[PDB]
């Protein structure tokens, strides 16, 4: 073969084979992890079930995450101050102080905001003049009309603790930073020696249309229903029934062409409050066609099967049900059993004996 | 009832723009281009093959040196390739794992990534530390970001899930200008070769042309029946390509402010994913849900080529900066290049 190619190639192809070895090894987390989708309409129900299935963590104050949230708490402070100076600029008449050198000296650090590491004595020394200036708070109360980070006023009063070099913030400041509004609240744990990821939606858009196809090769999808919702008011239309919209969107999931092999797991997470409310508010509001009985323990199963029979033309979708639970260890044990059922089914399918 | 009076005046102004559109219409392009010369039969072979992935492929991007190619996974990887030598030069992980778009720098130093979690990330390659560092972050949008492009090495334009677009500067981490005016969610965008105008396409059958520095809705383009999923720009800076869910890709012109020509092959019901031009301005390269790509002539109004070398649905395609080659990425966990 060739020689002059090999000199530069002992960097090039060495890099390619090394990065190929670094890329192929992801099967340790690619195939060992089994993806679960979460969806429903009971938001507090969702939060309670996800906090119960999560193993109860405390990892906000570790010494390995230290510099990470340090960079976060630095970035938030500089973002907030440049945002409020942008707001002061967008105030149509200038409002500074008598000695206007504070607003001009701010431009030294607005141009000097091109660092990521440790905070300078210069930036602290100029923001201690900026927050001392009463104009920034005169516009900052008015900054609600504009885009504004809500955690602004906390650090800019407590800037002296920030100004100490080599200081470590606490769990409280971290938990003040790490609350996010919209996106994916992707949590994950490992139960019964199997790893599990858990994704969600927080009503990002009006209707789902595009991003559902991104979650294609998902082994399980978990729908949740707070079953004491028939009498609760859908306050976006004259149709009071909150149940029917959730049923319709559930029906749009079950007839989705991307989902013809993905099992569903159905939750009933508000039955205990239903068990007392059934007396005052029975089945006389939800449906006028249940002429069977009045009591809770059979009407619950009836509404379960009346939920279940919307599966259009499929005997390959294994709809699994549950009820509420106080100690959710058996609950997560049940969902463990369900997911291992569907994966052993998939395993014997791939083996070719069913 | 002043809202009804102003929407009456809105209706009559829509009547005025359609009056001006019918008035400035004299003769369509087809009868003027009845006497043009046909090209004939043009075949493309897959030159080199790229098979370094696991999950599906959502987006790719050519450089501005015809040397490097960028491509996004869906398993939390992001890989760049050399074009000629076909070696995996760099491949980075990221903290999220639901990405939907990339953009490479016109210089060749910055690479941008983003996706479902409403945050954009920019990375730096040319460092003294000998490894890629997580460099900069963009956050502020509500909905997921659709597509992003570089117009500079400092200023980045992007398109959100809240029916908006925005111009940011990477040193601040604050958006410079916000572009509101769309009604449906924006899906794709592209900018002019002169870096002065960009056009956004939503799911609401309308295309908005924006001047980058003014921040006013300069031009609107109605006519469609459904979502726009593909935008490409003409190399002169006068025309603009579209695409929709039933292969009804329509040509527009920004100077004359009017529809040019709709395209429709009689055996196609499938959707569009992304469209691309050539250096000539006589070629439209596009892909459909039946795995098929085909070159459509701009002036002749019809050709049904075949280069359907994908088992799964085609996802993204592009033309090179010099127009030498073209690149195709689909959900087969592969990446192919035609010439």
């Amino acid at each position: 073969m060739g020689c002059t190619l090999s000199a530069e190639d002992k960097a090039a192809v060495e890099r390619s084979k090394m990065i190929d070895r670094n890329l192929r090894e992801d099967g340790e987390k690619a195939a060992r992890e089994v993806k679960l989708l979460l969806l429903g309409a009971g938001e507090s129900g969702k939060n309670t079930i996800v906090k119960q299935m999560k193993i109860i963590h405390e990892a906000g104050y570790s010494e390995e995450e230290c510099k990470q949230y340090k960079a976060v708490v630095y970035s938030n402070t500089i973002q907030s101050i440049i945002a409020i100076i942008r707001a002061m600029g967008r105030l149509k008449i200038d409002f500074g102080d008598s000695a206007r050198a504070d607003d001009a000296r701010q431009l030294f650090v607005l141009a000097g905001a091109a660092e990521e590491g440790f905070m300078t004595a210069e930036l602290a020394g100029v923001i201690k003049r900026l927050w001392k200036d009463s104009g920034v708070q005169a516009c900052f109360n008015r900054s609600r009309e504009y885009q504004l980070n809500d955690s602004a006023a906390y650090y800019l009063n407590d800037l002296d603790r920030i100004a100490q070099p080599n200081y470590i913030p606490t769990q409280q400041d971290v938990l003040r930073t790490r609350v996010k509004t919209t996106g994916i609240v992707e949590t994950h744990f490992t139960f019964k020696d199997l790893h599990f990821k858990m994704f969600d939606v927080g009503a990002q858009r009006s209707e789902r249309k595009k991003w559902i196809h991104c979650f294609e090769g998902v082994t399980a999808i978990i729908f949740c229903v707070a079953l004491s919702d028939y009498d609760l008011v859908l306050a976006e239309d004259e149709e009071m029934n909150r149940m029917h919209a959730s049923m319709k969107l559930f029906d749009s999931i079950c007839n989705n062409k991307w989902f013809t092999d993905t099992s569903i797991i159905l939750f009933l997470n508000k039955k205990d409050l239903f068990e007392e409310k059934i007396k005052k508010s029975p089945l006389t509001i939800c449906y006028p066609e249940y002429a069977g009985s009045n009591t809770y323990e059979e009407a619950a199963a009836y509404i379960q099967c009346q939920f279940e029979d919307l599966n259009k033309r499929k005997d390959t979708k294994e709809i699994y049900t549950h009820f509420t639970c106080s100690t959710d260890t058996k609950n997560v044990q049940f969902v463990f059993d369900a997911v291992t059922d569907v994966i052993i089914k998939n395993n014997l399918k791939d083996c070719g004996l069913f | 009832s002043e809202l009804d009076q102003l929407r009456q005046e809105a209706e009559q102004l829509k009547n005025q723009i359609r009056d001006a559109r019918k008035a400035c219409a004299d003769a369509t392009l087809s009868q003027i281009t009845n006497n043009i010369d046909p090209v004939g039969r043009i075949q493309m072979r897959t030159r080199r093959t790229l098979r370094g992935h696991l999950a599906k492929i959502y987006a790719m991007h050519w450089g501005t040196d015809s040397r490097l190619l960028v491509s996004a996974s869906q398993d939390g990887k992001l890989i760049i390739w050399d074009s000629y030598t076909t070696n995996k030069v760099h491949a980075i992980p990221l903290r999220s794992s639901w990405v939907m778009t990339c953009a490479y720098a016109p210089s060749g130093n910055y690479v941008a990534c983003g996706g479902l979690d409403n945050i954009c990330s920019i990375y730096n390659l040319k460092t003294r530390e000998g490894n890629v560092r997580v460099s900069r972050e963009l956050a502020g949008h509500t909905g997921y970001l659709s597509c992003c492009r570089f117009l500079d090495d400092n200023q980045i334009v992007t398109s959100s899930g809240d029916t908006t677009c925005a111009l940011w500067d990477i040193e601040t981490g604050q958006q410079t200008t916000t572009f509101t005016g769309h009604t449906g969610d924006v899906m794709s965008l592209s900018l002019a070769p002169d870096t002065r105008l960009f056009v956004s396409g939503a799911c609401d059958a309308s295309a908005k042309l924006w001047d980058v520095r003014e921040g006013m809705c300069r031009q609107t383009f109605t006519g469609h029946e459904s979502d726009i999923n593909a935008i490409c720009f003409f190399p002169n800076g006068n025309a603009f390509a579209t695409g929709s869910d039933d292969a009804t890709c329509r040509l527009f012109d920004l100077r004359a402010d009017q529809e040019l020509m709709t395209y429709s092959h009689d055996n196609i019901i499938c959707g569009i994913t992304s469209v691309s031009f050539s250096k000539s301005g006589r070629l439209l390269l596009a892909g459909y849900d039946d795995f098929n790509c085909n070159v459509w002539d701009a002036l002749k109004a019809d050709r049904a080529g075949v280069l359907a070398g994908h088992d799964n649905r085609v996802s993204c395609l592009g033309v090179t900066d010099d127009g030498m080659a073209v690149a195709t990425g689909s959900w087969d966990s592969f990446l192919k290049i035609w010439n």
Partner: antibody
Amino acid sequence: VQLVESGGGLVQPGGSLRLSCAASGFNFYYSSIHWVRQAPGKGLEWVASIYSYSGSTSYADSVKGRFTISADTSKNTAYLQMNSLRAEDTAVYYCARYPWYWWMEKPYLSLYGMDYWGQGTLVTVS
Amino acid sequence: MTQSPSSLSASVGDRVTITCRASQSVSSAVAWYQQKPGKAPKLLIYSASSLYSGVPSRFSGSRSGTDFTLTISSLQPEDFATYYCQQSSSSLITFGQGTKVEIK
């Protein structure tokens, strides 16, 4: 949009003269005016930079303290006076625009550099 | 607060590279200028990245740590002048020594 200058010549070394630079076409208060000299056969050395925002200006690394700058808020014109002469004052002078704060004139992107220049005056000694 | 250029030359139909290294870890306020002999200094690039509107797009400005680079790709023979760098981070304004171009 252009500029203009005046006040070139020669006086015996030690005294001062009036050097004028007029900017035209835009706002005066929403920018800063820079002064720079150039020596025959040499490079470029900075002289002065007056901010209309605060007025807390400064001068060069060596020639500071002995010159005096001014710029009027109405006529939009800068005037410079230069005592304490030496052999290295034989030079062609220029003035230029620098938008420090980019937002007050219009909410815009940033810009770092001298934007618009003149043709420059010339002063010598003997 | 000083810097270091690289004095060099060029020829026609080439791509030329101009380097600049500042003394301290300076921020991203770097400008580039062109000067025809005995004439006005015209700006090329402001903020080390974006070119000025109107100048042809055969020039570009690169930043790498504390190093700055002017890149001219496939010049035209109407470019015979002297180029200059400029630091503008602080309120203390400076320049480079600068270099010129001359063919064989």
